[PDB]
Structure formats: C-alpha cells, structure tokens
Design a protein around this ligand. Structure first.
Ligand SMILES: [Mg+2]
Ligand SMILES: [Mg+2]
Ligand SMILES: [Mg+2]
Ligand SMILES: [Mg+2]
Lengths: 157, 256, 158
RNA sequence: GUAAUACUCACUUUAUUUAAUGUAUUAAAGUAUAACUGCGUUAAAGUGUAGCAUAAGACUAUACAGUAAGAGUGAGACCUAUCAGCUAGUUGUUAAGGUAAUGGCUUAACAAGGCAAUGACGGGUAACGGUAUUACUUUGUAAUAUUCCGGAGAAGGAGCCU
C-alpha cells in the first residue's frame, strides 16, 4: 500500500484484522500502538505514518526490558543500523589515577527518525532481547548537538 | 555434569540448621516441597538435634512408623519431608504441639502452643485471578488454591487456614499501623509496627522504637492492630538488642 | 548431526576462533522436510521431554476460511502460484508457510463480488497458507479478497 | 586442551523444557513372549527347531507452586612492534527451514558494509579460572596442585540408540 519499504509479502500487522474492502481512513484508525515505560513518549511520526517494521518498538513486537544506556553516534552508512560510541573511566589502584576507555555498540534505528538525527549528537537507548548477530538494543530518544560557542550575528541575538 | 545433583556438603550447609562442622562430610539433601530452599529443614534433624527423642538412625524409624507424627494434621513417615515456616506439627500421643518460626539470632526454634491455636494456620496471598468457567481463585505462598472467597481480600493481604476443612476462615488486610513479622533478609525475626508503606519497601518501627527498612516480599503481617495479636509471640518478642547494649549489660553503663 | 551452536563463527573484528569442547546434545537439529502434494501421509516425531511433534510429508485437502461470510470449509489443493524466498519450489510443488495456492471451488458458497466471479465460473479460487506445515502437521489459511488480491497478482508468472 | 565463548559480579528470559514433590481440575470383551518340558550344536565365546505351548503386563489430559538445566547483555584479567593494517558468511535488509526456545544457527535474493596506536591481526606460555588460607606492608604487593564452588576429558578422532 505504501512504497517506502520494498516488500515480498503483504504488509499487514499482527493480530489486527478487519474486512477486506476497507477504506484508507478505516485502515488508519486501526493501527495498534504499543505501550511504553515511564519518561518516554511515542513520537508523532509513529502514528500518522503507514510503514510496517518488525523490529521497531512503536507499533511492533519487540518489548524492551532491562537497563538503559547512552552514547554518541559514530556512523550512519547502512540501513536501520547506527554505531553508538560509549565513553567511560576506569580506576587503577596502584598509581591512583584514571584511564579512558571506549566501546562500540551497533543499535537498531526505527523508521520514525529519518532526517532528524545527524552525526555527533546524543542518543538514549534501551536494551532488549537479541535481534541479530551483533544487534541487541533499540534507539528511543535523542537530543541535538549542543551549541555553546559559535559565531552569532545580530539576528542570532 | 549431565544431570541433577544428589549429594550435599556439610560446609555449604545453612548455618541456621545448627549443625556441627565437625567429623561429618555429607548432609541430607531434602525433597522438593511447597516451601523455598531457605525456609525448609529436614525432618530427621528435628527429632535428633532440636527435639531430643532419638539417638541414632534406628530410633528414627520407630517413632515415624508408629504414626504419631502429625504435620499440618497429616501423618507422615518419610524422614526427608521438609518442615517449612509457620506450620504446626504435633504428636498424637502426649498432646504436644509446636509452631515453627525463627528465633532472634537467625536459628530455628520450636514453641509449645495451646490446642485453641493448634487448629488454624496463617499464610499470605501472592496472586489472584479468575480460572475456567468463571470461578475466582486466590493463590497463597505454599501453593494451595482457594476459590469463592470474600472479594475484600486483595493480592497482599494475609489469610487464616482452618487446616481441617481446608477453608479460608478469616483474613487481615494490608495497611499502615499493623504489627508485622519478617522472615528473610539481613534482619530476620523482627516484630514491628508499620509507619510508612513505600512501593517496594516498608518503613517500620520496632518495639524498642527503632527503625529499619525491608522489602515487601520478606514480611508477613500477623495482625492489623497491636491489640489483635492473632498468634502468640516469642519470649524475646524479636527485639534483637544491639552490640552496644550487649556491651552495656556486661560491665554496666558508662557514667558521665 | 546438525548443530545450532555459535562457537564456530568468526569474531566481530574478523579474527579466527578456537573450540574447546565437543558437540553437545542440547543444540540438535534435523533436516528439511518438504511437504508435497499427493495422497496424505503423517509421521510422528519425538522432542525433548516427550512433547510429540507431527511432520507431514505429503499433504492434501487443507482447511481454509472465508473472510466475508465467516465460515470454514475444506477444499482440494491443485497448484502453487508463488513462493517468496526461492522460485524453484513452484516447479517441484512444495507447500510451505506463506505460499499462495489454487483450490477447488466446489463446496464453497461464495457471495457475489466483481473480482471472484470470473474465476468462480471455472473451478478454481485462490488461498494463502498461514501455518507451519512441517511442525504443526496441517495447513490452514485465508481466501484472497479485495486489495490483497491486487498485491499478489502483480507477482504472478504471466 | 582453552588468554576468552571458560570464571566472578550486577541484570533479562512475555524467547524456553523438567521423571520423583506439594495443592487442585478432569476422565475411565479381544491380542504376544518368558521362565518350564523335550531334541540338539561348536576348540572356545555364544546361539537353534518343536509343545495351536503356558503366566503377571501393555493397548486420561492439564494448571500453579517447588527443585534442576538451557539461552542472552555489560564490565573485569600474563609476556611480545625483530607482529601495522586486518576481515568475504565476513556486516546489514527481506523471506523460509530447523530447534523446547532468541539469534548468519543454515539456505535463496540484494546491498557494501564491520574493526583498529584507548594496540586490530598475529607469535609464546615450563597458562584450568575464582576462593577459604599464608607471608610482607604506611593508601597495597606475592604465592594459592593442597579446603570448598565452577568448567573440560576417559589411547586418538568421529557417529548414534535408550
Ligand atoms: Mg517359544
Ligand atoms: Mg548465500
Ligand atoms: Mg589458582
Ligand atoms: Mg594411560
């Protein structure tokens, strides 16, 4: 029905059944939206859109259980995958100083956020069950890159 | 290790069994039952160590096969039967009855009670839903199912089992300002008055006006009010004085 | 025979891996059972801790549901029209999950719609399977109606 | 044997199986082979043909607790630059098969991804990991086959029945 995602099977959702001869608005009011944890809202693009994804947590099957982490994006080249860089500090007991370590975690990107998220801004994720060989978490919310000091003209004031 | 384990070791035995870590090597691994792994004890240790009725393995079979031992109103002849928390065991001869709960120093005790208390039993609800053909059900801690009860009993309230007709008789609801009993955690055997109920813990008050916080799963309310006192209390009443006052009673208090 | 372990694959960085233990019985597999069309045949399986499974080697007279009138009736299975992942199954006539077929319209009592009328003059109608044949042991599905018929018929052989 | 997938700690399993235990729900005439009796066989080890031969047996289903086990995520851990580039089921998307179950775990089609001086990829070990417990100490080091918990193997490799 929508050609944003190329299909090899009929794009319907699980458990949501209706009469076959159905209008566009009758199809639109029957999309099931999942429930979330506290502190998180479903986005505006999760409701008005028409896509069907198996792995997106809004209008999907995967339930998020467990901890919640954070990071900075590193790459956005492939499809529905982004690489989140996590920084932390370890403590050495002999020299009594700190070191810097880093990890890379590939996480699943929902089709709701399309033109918003760029390179170099924070993402709040959540851990789920396993989804691939290397994919285990899901993007939930984002914030823009901070603008502390930049050239501001008089119209920027 | 392709299957289950059947041998237990004396060094990893629970310390609340009051066993000696001397000459023995193995200990009795008890059967699966209604209680958990922590609140259960084997029966053969009760007739040997805590109660003193037998000396060796032969005299254990004599009392058990004579069918006088009555746990929760049922005769039992297996030495591996687990005696849990809160159950009442009795002998048919000599009219001796006991209630089983912890002492003050995280050890098992046995307290002689009366025949008016020998009838009933207390337990705590954990879960409730409606089963097949529109019949309500209430599930307790030990795994008994009960139907057609009062609708005022909620998920966390306690019940009173008659133990002979197996019918729910009385219940005590869950609220603040109730007397409480604890059975797990780092603090066991404390008896307290509820002050503040949080979503996961409870803020309580001892009889010595102290304070402690404890998760909701580890407690059981025994009475709604101080004047209720549905069961009989232990002799110490679970006060568990600190090491400071234990250092104060030995040498006197510090004069200032 | 066929394992489902993960200890043999390469790392995330691309370096080789090394094993330290033999093959376990916990992760144990089987071969593919391709369900054909013919005279009916069902064999039984034994799974872990009882729990018998049924596999079907040759299947016939699958059950289907009419969506508009909401009744269920049996029909025969004639041909396969489309299979999503591998296009060679249509020449060997194997039935798996989500593969559309061609069924007889004898016992079916249809309503009067514009699209189904021309095929209802002949004996044939269309249906799509929705159950795992090799593990449940029997096929069930839905009859194509409406815009769902508009989607699959662009993918036909023509 | 394994430098980490093994081990320790903190989390998840609505993604899963469990004989013996506890409390509950449900259902309820016909058909073989042994031991026995009797004829035998081969150096040994074992095995055969009869007596329509003849006994006991075999032809309910599920819940919720309770024990036991499987599967995931993250963090920690020896020496080496006279080892600086490495990887092609390798990284991802769709679909199916298979398992008690998540998952390139396996297979079709398409795409070009994935990791690195915060040390990738290689080489060595006279390398089973923690722990109870010993020493020496001014923010902590060193030993720990030895008590206990956990993992792997039965001359070397592979395959399978109950
Ligand atoms: Mg015979
Ligand atoms: Mg391929
Ligand atoms: Mg060691
Ligand atoms: Mg040898």
């Amino acid at each position: 029905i929508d050609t944003t995602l190329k299909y090899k099977i009929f794009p319907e959702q699980k458990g949501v059944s209706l009469d076959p001869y159905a209008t566009a608005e009758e199809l639109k009011a029957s999309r099931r939206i999942n429930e979330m944890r506290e502190g998180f809202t479903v986005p505006k693009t999760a409701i008005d859109a028409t896509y069907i994804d198996k792995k997106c947590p809004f209008t999907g099957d995967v339930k998020v259980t467990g901890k919640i982490f954070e990071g900075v994006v590193y790459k956005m080249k492939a499809d529905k995958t982004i690489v989140v860089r996590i920084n932390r500090l370890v403590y050495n007991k002999k020299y009594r100083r700190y070191g810097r370590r880093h990890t890379n975690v590939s996480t699943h990107m929902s089709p709701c956020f399309e033109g918003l998220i760029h390179v170099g801004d924070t993402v709040i994720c959540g851990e789920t069950r396993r989804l691939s060989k290397t994919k285990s978490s899901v993007v939930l919310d984002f914030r823009k890159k901070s603008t502390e000091g930049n050239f501001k003209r008089l119209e920027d004031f | 290790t392709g299957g289950p384990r059947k041998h237990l070791n004396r060094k990893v035995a629970p310390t609340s069994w009051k066993l000696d870590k001397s000459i023995g090597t193995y200990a009795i691994r008890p059967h699966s039952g209604p209680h958990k792994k922590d609140l259960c004890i084997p029966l053969a240790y009760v007739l040997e160590k805590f109660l003193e009725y037998a000396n060796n393995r032969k005299e254990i079979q004599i009392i058990l096969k004579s069918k006088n031992i009555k746990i929760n109103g049922k005769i039992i002849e297996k030495r591996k039967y687990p005696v849990g928390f809160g159950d009442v065991l009795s002998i048919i001869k000599t009219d001796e009855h006991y209630r089983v709960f912890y002492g003050v120093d995280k050890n098992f005790t046995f307290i002689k009670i009366d025949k008016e208390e020998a009838n009933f039993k207390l337990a705590k609800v954990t879960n409730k839903k409606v089963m097949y053909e529109n019949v309500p059900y209430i599930f307790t801690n030990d795994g008994a199912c009960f139907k057609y009860c009062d609708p005022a009993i909620n998920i966390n309230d306690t019940v009173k089992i008659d133990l002979e007709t197996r019918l729910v008789v009385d219940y005590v609801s869950f609220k603040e300002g109730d007397v409480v009993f604890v059975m797990r955690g780092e603090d066991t055997g404390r008896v307290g008055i509820i002050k503040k109920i949080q979503n996961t813990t409870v803020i309580c008050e001892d009889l010595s006006n102290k304070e402690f916080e404890t998760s909701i799963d580890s407690m059981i309310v025994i009475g709604d009010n101080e004047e209720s006192l549905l069961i009989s209390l232990p002799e110490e009443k679970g006060i568990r004085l600190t090491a400071l006052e234990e250092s104060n009673l030995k040498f006197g208090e510090i004069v200032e | 025979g066929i394992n489902h372990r993960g200890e043999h694959k390469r790392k995330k960085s691309g370096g080789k891996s090394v094993l330290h233990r033999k093959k376990r019985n916990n992760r144990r597999g089987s071969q593919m059972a391709a369900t054909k069309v013919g005279s009916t045949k069902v064999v039984e399986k034994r799974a872990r801790g009882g729990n018998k499974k049924y596999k079907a080697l040759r299947l016939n007279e699958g059950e289907f549901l009419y969506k508009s009138g909401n009744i269920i009736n049996s029909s025969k299975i004639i041909e396969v029209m489309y299979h999503p992942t591998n296009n060679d199954y249509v020449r060997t006539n194997t039935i798996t999950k989500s593969s559309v077929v061609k069924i007889s319209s004898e016992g079916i009592k249809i309503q009067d719609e514009e699209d189904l009328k021309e095929m209802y003059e002949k004996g044939y109608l269309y249906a799509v399977i929705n159950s795992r044949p090799g593990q449940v042991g029997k096929a069930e599905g839905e009859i194509l109606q409406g815009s769902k018929l508009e989607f699959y018929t662009n993918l036909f052989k023509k």
